[PDB]
Amino acid sequence: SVLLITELPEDGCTEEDVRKLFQPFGKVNDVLIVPYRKEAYLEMEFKEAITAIMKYIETTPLTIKGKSVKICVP
Secondary structure (H helix, E strand, C coil): CEEEEECCCCCCCCHHHHHHHHHHHCCEEEEEEEHHHCEEEEEECCCHHHHHHHHHHCCCCCEECCEECEEECC
């Protein structure tokens, strides 16, 4: 349901940023951003987009502003 991405760009993280990157995978409702730790929390609508994100990362890392970020599960 909920994903965590860490190691965000030191300058260039918005709630809209994270949405744009992950929208092609599913319906994103709530996105929560805390810049103090350079991380954010996306709340995915269905559990199937989660397996879709994860199976994609085993070959190509997701990149925002050119920096690849690290995705973490509960």
